[PDB]
Design a binder for this molecule. Structure first.
Ligand code: HEM
Ligand SMILES: CC(=O)Nc1cc2cccnc2c2ncccc12
Ligand code: NI
Ligand code: NI
Length: 106
């Protein structure tokens, strides 16, 4: 999928988690988000069109998603243990990683 799709996926399922009622729904949402983040990590964003894959920006862009997956994994651990409310808390905290990347490269 392309960068925009992956970000829609990211956005939707974060809402799904905010709304969500029980553990299984949160776990499902995060798993889709995981997939998306990993896919987005492959894409070259428009603002980095002309930069070499080796460039600090490209590397820092890729690194952004490595952080994000790391955090989704944190939330999945919780969701997995059925700790729904703090799974949601973990998911909230993702938002800072999203905005941080958006300020640089969106
Ligand atoms: C879970 C946290 C995140 C959320 C909720 C999120 C949400 C969004 C949304 C709503 C858009 C607008 C899409 C559009 O214009 O069609 C977007 C775009 C974008 N996001 Fe994220 N995002 C997240 C994480 C990240 C991270 C970590 C990065 C960098 C590593 C990133 C990089 C970008 C870029 C470069 C765009 C521009 C879209 C384009 O020009 O095609 N996002 N994101
Ligand atoms: C250090 C780093 O960020 N490398 C790369 C970062 C990348 C970020 C978006 C898309 N592709 C890459 C990429 N592709 C091939 C080889 C390396 C990279
Ligand atoms: Ni793709
Ligand atoms: Ni690449």
């Amino acid at each position: 999928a392309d960068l925009e799709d992956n970000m829609e996926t990211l956005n939707d399922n974060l809402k799904v988690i905010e709304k969500a009622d029980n553990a299984a729904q949160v776990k499902d949402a995060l798993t889709k988000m995981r997939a998306a983040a990993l896919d987005a990590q492959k894409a070259t964003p428009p603002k980095l069109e002309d930069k070499s894959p080796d460039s600090p920006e490209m590397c820092d862009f890729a690194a952004g998603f490595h952080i994000l997956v790391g955090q989704i994994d944190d939330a999945l651990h919780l969701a997995n243990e059925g700790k729904v409310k703090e799974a949601q808390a973990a998911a909230e905290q993702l938002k800072t990683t999203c905005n941080a990347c958006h300020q640089k490269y969106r």
